[PDB]
Amino acid sequence: GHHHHHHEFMHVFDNNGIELKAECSIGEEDGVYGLILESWGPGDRNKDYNIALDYIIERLVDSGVSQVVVYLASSSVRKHMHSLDERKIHPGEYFTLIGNSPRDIRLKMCGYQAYFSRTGRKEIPSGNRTKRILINVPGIYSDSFWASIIRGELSELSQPTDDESLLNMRVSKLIKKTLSQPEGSRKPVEVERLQKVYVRDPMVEAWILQQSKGICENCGKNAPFYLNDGNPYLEVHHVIPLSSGGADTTDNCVALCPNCHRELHYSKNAKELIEMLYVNINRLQK
Amino acid sequence: HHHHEFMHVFDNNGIELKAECSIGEEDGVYGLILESWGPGDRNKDYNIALDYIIERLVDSGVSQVVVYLASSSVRKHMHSLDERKIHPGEYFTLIGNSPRDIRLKMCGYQAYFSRTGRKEIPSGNRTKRILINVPGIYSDSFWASIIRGELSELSQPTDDESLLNMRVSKLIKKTLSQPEGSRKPVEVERLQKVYVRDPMVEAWILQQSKGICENCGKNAPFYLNDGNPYLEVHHVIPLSSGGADTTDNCVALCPNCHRELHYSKNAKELIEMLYVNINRLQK
Ligand SMILES: [Zn+2]
Ligand SMILES: [Zn+2]
Ligand SMILES: [Zn+2]
Ligand SMILES: [Zn+2]
């Protein structure tokens, strides 16, 4: 319901539950979804930008978010830069929050905004450091997650949930802590849900599997196991995902073993392997 | 006002036969229009292609057809459909020991016609342009399945991942020309039934594995960002089947081993070996 009703801006709450002068919103823009922090304006409109950003980073880390992706989201940048790889403010595919304190992470984040102008990228970080920005956590499409980050009341890490992205996020943090044997649920709670899924083409899948000849196209190795019908098991992967508006065509699909298909989603060196395949496989067109 | 979807008849393995046809409507009659075995070996394997058609028609419930001559000479010189009908009786029935012997009956009737009209002595061609009509049926997708076999049904796109797998599995057997596909696929909001899952259970299981799988020995395929070893937790008795979300019903596996327990037929035996090796598990 984003039509006929002028959406009002949400404001980030401090640790005492009190509203900050720091406009924000939760939404999707140009294929990417997350928290859109509004810019520090002329005449001190969003005076608490920096301190509000400190709290967001703080709360993401305590909720188990290790890595994020921050995009430049002022109206000019989105016009003059059409790709997602270029609108991102930081080098590498994922900005990590693990290393340092929330202020240090923020200073750096605010710093990388200065390397942008309205035409494009600058030689030096001379620009403004308090622009409109979009913070993406990969895998997370939940409005309630971002709502809690703005609100300041977070869920406990042990909290059960139906969201599998939210589960993984919490586990990734729980692995670092010493866990005693948890009791669990002998009768787990089922829940009806809606999910968005794309209609896929069996011919594009089937064509890509035949051409592979049952060998993974990233690593050189052959398929791990065989199906009941006798065929080898690989998994077809869209190099430009369908969530990010990619095509369902043979010229951006690739057959991989389960392990490599996982590598390309989550690995620390995932940017190397995705470019590597655009050289090797000549049908793959970016 | 005639419409046509042009095709070649396919065999059971998806190979394009030398037997061009169409799903068309001509003079009110809608059906499969199989082109002639030509003057210079045009449509070489007409008779082969017609056997598949007769086989598929019988497989899909059709026992009766009407066959008209549809050559442009006959069209001109024979002025009613009733005289263009090759067989006596309202229908030609698809019954016999073989589709081939049925085809010989059907083509036997064709010999009783010249290019200009009906022939007193059957001394004519047995391999002519004909329209195979099934009155009552007006589906292109029905005739597409008669023309292309099971390959036309299996090629249909879907959101259902289980059905997408059944179809893909069967399409790997067939020979396939290049698909093209869609450059802007449609997203569907569909209903789903998921379970509320405990992250203490999952995180405990991943800790006690120490980065190695519980059916193959190997380490994690890659180290996840922030240095974690990448494995996947899987419920040995599914939550669908009344499985508990407990440490005694979970195992850590690499993606290869995870898919192996799901999609193999030999998975039902792999499960048994987890109860032997991993003595934590209860059932
Ligand atoms: Zn994929
Ligand atoms: Zn591989
Ligand atoms: Zn599983
Ligand atoms: Zn394994």
XYZ file of C-alpha atoms and ligand atoms in Angstrom:
573
model
C 0.000 0.000 0.000
C 2.454 2.640 -1.260
C -0.106 4.589 -3.398
C -2.710 7.305 -2.549
C -1.264 7.797 0.998
C 1.742 10.126 1.460
C 4.254 7.894 3.263
C 5.661 9.630 6.350
C 9.293 9.217 7.394
C 10.243 6.911 10.262
C 12.804 8.119 12.788
C 15.571 6.127 14.458
C 15.077 5.614 18.193
C 18.017 6.028 20.588
C 18.775 3.506 23.405
C 16.320 5.243 25.798
C 13.495 4.727 23.250
C 13.423 8.418 22.257
C 12.995 9.641 18.662
C 16.121 11.027 16.915
C 16.319 13.739 14.247
C 17.215 11.114 11.655
C 14.652 10.377 8.958
C 14.669 6.891 7.469
C 12.456 4.332 5.749
C 12.227 0.649 4.851
C 11.722 -0.196 1.175
C 12.996 -1.531 -2.141
C 14.601 0.713 -4.765
C 16.022 -0.230 -8.179
C 16.277 -3.975 -7.413
C 17.802 -3.678 -3.887
C 16.017 -3.770 -0.496
C 16.839 -2.360 2.965
C 16.962 0.656 5.284
C 17.164 4.018 3.512
C 18.753 6.602 5.810
C 17.953 10.126 4.600
C 20.730 12.667 4.087
C 21.823 15.343 6.541
C 20.134 18.366 5.000
C 20.696 22.099 4.723
C 19.643 23.918 7.924
C 20.113 20.850 10.174
C 17.066 18.789 9.091
C 18.570 15.414 10.115
C 20.958 16.670 12.800
C 21.350 13.142 14.320
C 22.472 11.342 11.076
C 25.864 10.254 12.470
C 24.604 9.165 15.908
C 21.596 7.417 14.275
C 23.975 5.570 11.964
C 26.092 4.556 14.998
C 23.044 2.881 16.567
C 22.051 1.034 13.357
C 25.551 -0.484 13.008
C 25.570 -1.338 16.728
C 22.219 -3.171 16.497
C 23.007 -5.061 13.277
C 26.172 -6.460 14.932
C 24.332 -7.491 18.140
C 21.645 -9.200 16.000
C 24.350 -11.276 14.195
C 24.928 -9.364 10.949
C 28.630 -9.805 10.076
C 28.639 -8.255 6.598
C 26.429 -5.721 4.777
C 26.262 -3.830 1.473
C 25.844 -0.026 1.463
C 24.657 1.805 -1.679
C 24.676 5.494 -2.530
C 20.972 6.357 -2.809
C 20.681 10.108 -3.511
C 18.528 10.917 -6.570
C 21.548 12.026 -8.659
C 23.656 8.849 -8.183
C 20.782 6.537 -9.241
C 20.352 8.559 -12.487
C 24.041 8.650 -13.490
C 24.960 5.135 -12.260
C 22.725 2.292 -13.441
C 24.663 -0.762 -12.171
C 24.579 -2.014 -8.552
C 28.344 -2.745 -8.592
C 29.106 0.966 -9.245
C 26.558 2.539 -6.830
C 28.051 0.530 -3.935
C 30.330 2.823 -1.913
C 32.922 0.255 -0.763
C 35.527 -1.986 -2.473
C 34.689 -5.706 -2.450
C 31.201 -7.211 -2.446
C 30.634 -7.077 1.345
C 31.373 -4.326 3.922
C 32.184 -6.079 7.241
C 31.137 -4.796 10.681
C 33.175 -7.366 12.694
C 36.561 -5.580 12.871
C 35.954 -2.392 14.850
C 33.588 -0.286 16.972
C 30.379 1.169 15.432
C 31.904 4.703 15.279
C 34.965 3.493 13.334
C 32.726 1.515 10.945
C 30.561 4.650 10.557
C 33.468 7.072 10.003
C 34.701 4.818 7.187
C 31.187 4.390 5.739
C 30.612 8.156 5.875
C 34.102 8.550 4.386
C 33.405 6.411 1.317
C 30.375 8.627 0.534
C 32.821 11.534 -0.079
C 34.387 9.662 -3.041
C 31.064 10.276 -4.920
C 29.923 13.358 -6.803
C 26.661 13.851 -8.734
C 28.246 12.980 -12.126
C 30.182 9.961 -10.806
C 33.166 8.847 -8.714
C 35.749 11.434 -7.534
C 39.541 11.211 -7.453
C 39.686 12.245 -3.759
C 37.169 11.988 -0.866
C 36.321 15.718 -0.920
C 32.523 15.356 -0.936
C 29.791 15.418 1.688
C 29.767 12.462 4.146
C 26.065 12.482 5.090
C 24.203 11.577 1.896
C 21.102 9.457 1.276
C 22.122 5.780 1.532
C 20.604 2.277 1.398
C 21.892 -0.452 3.759
C 21.406 -4.001 2.450
C 21.948 -7.162 4.460
C 22.232 -10.012 1.931
C 19.430 -12.610 2.267
C 17.121 -10.417 4.381
C 13.792 -9.202 2.947
C 11.915 -8.823 6.275
C 10.382 -5.402 7.116
C 10.089 -6.500 10.765
C 13.878 -7.034 10.951
C 14.622 -3.462 9.841
C 11.756 -2.228 12.032
C 13.513 -3.620 15.145
C 16.835 -1.994 14.125
C 15.117 1.425 13.956
C 13.120 0.661 17.144
C 16.084 -0.543 19.222
C 14.338 -3.567 20.768
C 16.115 -6.628 19.325
C 15.271 -10.317 19.547
C 17.478 -12.659 21.595
C 19.904 -14.779 19.521
C 18.388 -18.027 20.867
C 14.904 -16.945 19.643
C 13.297 -19.508 17.273
C 11.990 -18.253 13.917
C 10.451 -19.317 10.590
C 12.770 -16.968 8.609
C 15.758 -19.061 7.460
C 17.922 -15.995 6.686
C 17.245 -14.829 10.254
C 18.094 -18.299 11.609
C 21.476 -18.432 9.805
C 22.296 -14.893 10.977
C 21.645 -15.947 14.608
C 23.558 -19.241 14.263
C 26.619 -17.480 12.742
C 26.794 -15.472 16.012
C 25.942 -18.464 18.295
C 28.887 -20.511 16.860
C 31.339 -18.124 18.600
C 29.693 -18.684 22.038
C 29.986 -21.825 24.212
C 26.659 -23.668 23.904
C 25.366 -26.300 26.335
C 23.055 -29.036 24.976
C 19.785 -27.274 24.006
C 16.504 -29.149 24.590
C 14.714 -28.038 21.379
C 11.150 -28.819 20.243
C 9.751 -32.368 20.020
C 6.623 -30.867 18.367
C 7.808 -27.936 16.186
C 5.284 -25.264 15.214
C 4.176 -25.187 11.559
C 3.099 -21.900 9.954
C 1.447 -20.912 6.655
C 3.451 -18.300 4.736
C 3.649 -16.551 1.358
C 6.872 -16.510 -0.665
C 7.838 -14.963 -4.018
C 9.319 -17.504 -6.463
C 10.068 -17.202 -10.211
C 8.572 -19.467 -12.917
C 11.601 -21.349 -14.286
C 12.238 -22.827 -17.738
C 12.924 -26.622 -17.777
C 14.470 -26.373 -21.267
C 17.053 -23.766 -20.162
C 17.863 -25.967 -17.134
C 18.023 -29.156 -19.245
C 20.136 -27.588 -22.046
C 22.736 -26.298 -19.534
C 23.001 -29.759 -17.897
C 23.626 -31.575 -21.226
C 26.312 -29.094 -22.360
C 28.133 -29.494 -19.016
C 28.473 -33.270 -19.638
C 28.061 -33.807 -15.875
C 31.206 -31.822 -14.939
C 31.039 -28.735 -12.712
C 31.808 -25.573 -14.709
C 33.618 -23.718 -11.837
C 35.752 -26.531 -10.360
C 36.961 -29.177 -12.837
C 35.395 -32.145 -11.011
C 32.566 -34.477 -12.048
C 29.093 -34.616 -10.406
C 28.999 -36.058 -6.823
C 26.019 -38.452 -7.019
C 23.453 -39.796 -9.514
C 19.641 -39.597 -9.464
C 17.146 -42.478 -9.328
C 16.670 -42.085 -13.133
C 20.468 -42.330 -13.739
C 21.357 -38.705 -14.612
C 24.157 -36.812 -12.795
C 23.259 -34.188 -10.171
C 24.497 -30.662 -10.803
C 22.602 -27.438 -9.990
C 21.947 -24.703 -12.542
C 22.820 -21.225 -11.249
C 21.907 -17.824 -12.713
C 25.130 -15.752 -12.687
C 23.050 -12.569 -12.551
C 20.275 -13.645 -10.080
C 16.524 -13.475 -10.758
C 15.944 -11.578 -7.482
C 18.233 -8.871 -8.962
C 16.309 -8.789 -12.311
C 18.464 -11.193 -14.355
C 17.443 -13.138 -17.464
C 16.451 -16.839 -17.522
C 18.579 -17.664 -20.574
C 21.380 -20.104 -21.466
C 23.701 -17.046 -21.764
C 23.645 -16.429 -17.966
C 23.027 -19.958 -16.567
C 25.731 -22.399 -15.431
C 25.789 -25.978 -14.073
C 27.730 -26.498 -10.827
C 28.184 -29.132 -8.115
C 26.244 -28.324 -4.873
C 29.465 -27.082 -3.177
C 30.418 -24.614 -5.957
C 26.813 -23.320 -6.180
C 27.126 -22.562 -2.457
C 30.612 -21.003 -2.941
C 29.308 -18.443 -5.452
C 26.568 -17.215 -3.051
C 28.479 -17.031 0.259
C 32.286 -17.317 -0.076
C 34.801 -14.623 0.896
C 36.415 -14.989 -2.586
C 33.066 -15.063 -4.492
C 33.942 -11.982 -6.607
C 37.003 -13.806 -8.073
C 35.057 -16.919 -9.145
C 32.174 -14.932 -10.743
C 34.573 -12.965 -13.017
C 36.623 -16.149 -13.699
C 33.548 -17.823 -15.244
C 32.806 -14.810 -17.510
C 36.268 -15.446 -19.116
C 36.085 -19.283 -19.328
C 32.499 -19.743 -20.523
C 32.121 -17.576 -23.669
C 28.316 -18.001 -23.920
C 28.011 -16.158 -20.551
C 27.179 -12.541 -21.496
C 27.139 -9.743 -18.867
C -9.703 -17.155 -42.521
C -7.131 -19.905 -41.834
C -4.593 -20.088 -38.967
C -1.619 -22.522 -38.704
C 1.105 -23.486 -36.217
C 3.847 -25.145 -38.295
C 5.831 -28.141 -37.056
C 7.733 -31.321 -37.905
C 6.727 -34.595 -36.267
C 9.194 -35.723 -33.563
C 10.091 -39.271 -32.498
C 10.044 -40.492 -28.851
C 13.618 -39.219 -28.262
C 12.925 -35.657 -29.534
C 14.597 -35.901 -32.967
C 12.988 -33.774 -35.707
C 11.720 -36.202 -38.390
C 11.513 -35.414 -42.123
C 7.743 -35.037 -41.901
C 6.466 -31.463 -41.808
C 2.913 -30.741 -40.628
C 0.779 -28.122 -38.886
C -1.979 -27.593 -36.353
C -4.403 -25.700 -38.583
C -7.999 -24.949 -39.484
C -9.017 -25.212 -43.170
C -12.647 -25.031 -44.390
C -13.992 -25.178 -40.808
C -12.070 -28.364 -39.977
C -9.413 -28.087 -37.245
C -6.668 -30.686 -36.741
C -3.244 -32.077 -37.649
C -2.385 -31.391 -41.313
C 0.408 -33.789 -42.312
C 2.137 -32.677 -45.542
C 2.643 -35.002 -48.529
C 5.537 -37.399 -49.245
C 6.649 -35.163 -52.083
C 7.763 -35.617 -55.693
C 11.524 -35.601 -54.911
C 11.743 -37.312 -51.492
C 10.178 -34.356 -49.619
C 9.154 -35.603 -46.150
C 11.038 -38.911 -46.574
C 9.674 -40.562 -43.394
C 5.944 -39.657 -43.681
C 4.802 -43.198 -42.805
C 7.129 -43.331 -39.777
C 5.793 -39.972 -38.517
C 2.173 -41.119 -38.919
C 2.780 -44.254 -36.799
C 3.903 -42.060 -33.879
C 0.774 -39.896 -34.347
C -1.512 -42.970 -34.297
C 0.400 -44.356 -31.276
C 0.062 -41.066 -29.324
C -3.610 -40.600 -30.260
C -4.418 -44.046 -28.828
C -2.329 -43.325 -25.681
C -4.336 -40.132 -24.933
C -7.835 -41.718 -25.181
C -8.711 -40.992 -28.832
C -10.149 -44.096 -30.528
C -11.867 -42.348 -33.495
C -10.700 -39.802 -36.078
C -11.951 -38.247 -39.311
C -9.388 -37.983 -42.124
C -9.880 -35.580 -45.036
C -7.732 -35.034 -48.112
C -6.333 -31.485 -47.958
C -4.257 -31.116 -51.155
C -4.934 -27.851 -53.035
C -5.897 -29.795 -56.195
C -8.589 -31.749 -54.291
C -9.635 -28.500 -52.519
C -10.418 -27.015 -55.973
C -11.990 -29.989 -57.803
C -13.854 -31.624 -54.868
C -16.354 -29.091 -53.503
C -17.677 -30.745 -50.279
C -15.922 -32.140 -47.173
C -18.024 -35.340 -47.282
C -16.433 -36.314 -50.628
C -12.964 -35.231 -49.338
C -13.367 -37.759 -46.477
C -11.106 -40.731 -47.367
C -12.912 -43.477 -45.388
C -16.493 -44.787 -45.501
C -18.384 -44.336 -42.236
C -18.409 -41.231 -40.057
C -15.071 -42.119 -38.387
C -11.893 -44.111 -38.970
C -11.282 -46.157 -35.799
C -7.787 -46.595 -34.373
C -7.854 -50.339 -33.600
C -5.368 -53.065 -34.560
C -2.383 -55.161 -33.470
C 0.054 -52.336 -34.355
C 0.026 -48.576 -35.134
C 1.790 -49.558 -38.391
C -0.998 -51.887 -39.590
C -3.561 -49.177 -38.632
C -1.544 -46.711 -40.741
C -1.650 -49.158 -43.695
C -5.464 -49.290 -43.418
C -5.612 -45.487 -43.312
C -3.199 -44.982 -46.236
C -5.004 -47.760 -48.166
C -8.036 -45.458 -48.363
C -5.886 -42.617 -49.823
C -5.138 -44.754 -52.927
C -8.832 -44.456 -53.980
C -8.363 -40.761 -54.975
C -6.759 -38.945 -57.916
C -5.716 -35.275 -57.806
C -9.095 -34.257 -59.377
C -11.599 -36.672 -57.716
C -12.528 -40.168 -56.484
C -10.882 -43.098 -58.314
C -12.728 -46.250 -59.496
C -9.487 -48.317 -59.367
C -7.251 -47.606 -56.342
C -4.130 -46.779 -58.393
C -2.964 -43.610 -56.645
C -0.495 -42.277 -54.096
C -0.761 -43.555 -50.498
C 1.148 -40.606 -48.956
C -0.797 -37.367 -49.478
C -1.604 -34.118 -47.697
C -4.347 -34.992 -45.185
C -6.131 -33.420 -42.216
C -6.572 -35.644 -39.163
C -9.629 -34.210 -37.390
C -10.792 -34.999 -33.870
C -14.148 -33.191 -33.586
C -14.732 -31.996 -30.005
C -11.044 -31.224 -29.507
C -9.993 -27.613 -30.209
C -6.674 -27.466 -28.256
C -3.323 -26.581 -29.901
C -1.550 -28.042 -26.840
C -3.298 -31.389 -27.411
C -2.100 -31.594 -31.026
C 1.346 -30.269 -30.037
C 1.678 -33.342 -27.784
C 0.605 -35.624 -30.670
C 3.180 -33.934 -32.927
C 6.064 -33.599 -30.437
C 5.291 -36.438 -27.966
C 5.848 -35.932 -24.219
C 8.505 -33.248 -24.983
C 5.861 -30.482 -25.467
C 4.312 -31.075 -21.991
C 7.726 -31.339 -20.289
C 8.985 -28.077 -21.867
C 6.261 -25.983 -20.141
C 7.635 -23.532 -17.512
C 6.489 -23.589 -13.866
C 7.025 -22.188 -10.375
C 6.557 -25.644 -8.734
C 10.154 -26.793 -8.051
C 9.191 -30.486 -7.665
C 7.454 -30.481 -11.071
C 10.370 -28.510 -12.602
C 12.636 -31.373 -11.419
C 10.404 -34.164 -12.814
C 10.327 -32.446 -16.214
C 14.057 -31.561 -16.306
C 14.982 -35.162 -15.363
C 12.999 -36.492 -18.341
C 14.269 -33.751 -20.742
C 17.924 -34.869 -20.193
C 17.082 -38.141 -22.029
C 15.838 -36.220 -25.114
C 17.947 -34.415 -27.744
C 17.338 -30.663 -27.400
C 17.722 -27.710 -29.777
C 18.549 -24.292 -28.236
C 15.766 -22.977 -25.936
C 16.145 -19.146 -25.859
C 13.722 -18.859 -22.864
C 12.634 -15.645 -21.078
C 14.712 -12.503 -20.352
C 12.131 -11.273 -17.782
C 10.631 -14.241 -15.832
C 7.328 -13.823 -13.959
C 7.416 -13.959 -10.133
C 4.504 -15.731 -8.413
C 3.386 -15.199 -4.814
C 2.655 -18.803 -3.732
C 1.584 -20.353 -0.413
C 4.206 -22.187 1.653
C 4.236 -24.306 4.831
C 7.397 -23.832 6.920
C 8.409 -24.664 10.492
C 9.617 -22.487 13.377
C 13.206 -23.625 13.962
C 15.501 -23.407 17.012
C 18.900 -21.763 16.250
C 20.457 -23.271 19.422
C 19.900 -26.772 18.026
C 21.402 -25.847 14.642
C 24.391 -23.925 16.079
C 25.127 -26.749 18.554
C 25.202 -29.321 15.719
C 27.553 -27.132 13.626
C 29.944 -26.677 16.610
C 30.201 -30.410 17.412
C 30.994 -31.286 13.749
C 34.209 -29.131 13.858
C 33.951 -28.409 10.103
C 33.785 -32.066 8.906
C 30.759 -33.904 7.440
C 29.034 -36.803 9.259
C 28.829 -39.217 6.267
C 31.819 -38.226 4.062
C 35.031 -37.327 5.915
C 35.906 -34.120 4.037
C 36.233 -30.593 5.464
C 33.957 -27.658 4.552
C 34.090 -26.760 0.807
C 35.012 -23.138 1.685
C 35.533 -20.990 4.785
C 32.597 -18.624 5.234
C 33.346 -14.921 5.816
C 34.368 -14.352 9.446
C 36.239 -17.699 9.197
C 33.365 -20.152 9.880
C 33.467 -23.601 8.209
C 30.501 -23.868 5.786
C 28.201 -26.825 6.504
C 24.435 -27.340 6.349
C 22.229 -28.893 9.043
C 19.598 -31.447 7.940
C 16.793 -33.162 9.876
C 17.194 -36.967 9.478
C 13.459 -37.394 10.124
C 11.796 -34.445 8.348
C 9.719 -31.948 10.330
C 6.957 -32.735 7.777
C 7.031 -36.413 8.873
C 6.797 -35.476 12.595
C 10.531 -35.099 13.240
C 11.757 -33.250 16.326
C 13.923 -30.125 16.039
C 16.496 -31.621 18.401
C 20.175 -32.574 18.495
C 19.102 -36.256 18.278
C 17.406 -35.617 14.868
C 20.024 -33.369 13.133
C 23.333 -33.860 11.282
C 25.930 -31.523 9.718
C 26.729 -32.201 6.030
C 28.470 -30.548 3.071
C 26.080 -29.462 0.251
C 26.977 -32.576 -1.826
C 26.112 -34.911 1.077
C 22.955 -32.879 1.886
C 21.593 -33.306 -1.679
C 22.667 -36.984 -1.615
C 20.326 -37.722 1.345
C 17.447 -35.826 -0.347
C 17.441 -36.712 -4.078
C 19.088 -40.180 -4.403
C 17.139 -43.461 -4.304
C 20.190 -44.885 -2.478
C 19.558 -42.170 0.192
C 17.185 -44.525 2.075
C 20.254 -46.730 2.707
C 22.595 -43.754 3.483
C 20.205 -42.765 6.330
C 20.747 -46.179 7.958
C 24.517 -45.572 8.175
C 24.032 -42.317 10.152
C 22.362 -44.282 12.991
C 25.383 -46.652 13.001
C 28.179 -44.051 12.933
C 26.449 -41.216 14.868
C 25.237 -42.728 18.183
C 23.808 -39.387 19.394
C 20.797 -39.928 17.087
C 17.493 -41.395 18.316
C 14.402 -42.642 16.477
Zn 21.661 -19.725 -8.029
Zn 32.108 -28.049 -8.385
Zn 17.608 -31.039 4.604
Zn 30.017 -34.463 2.782
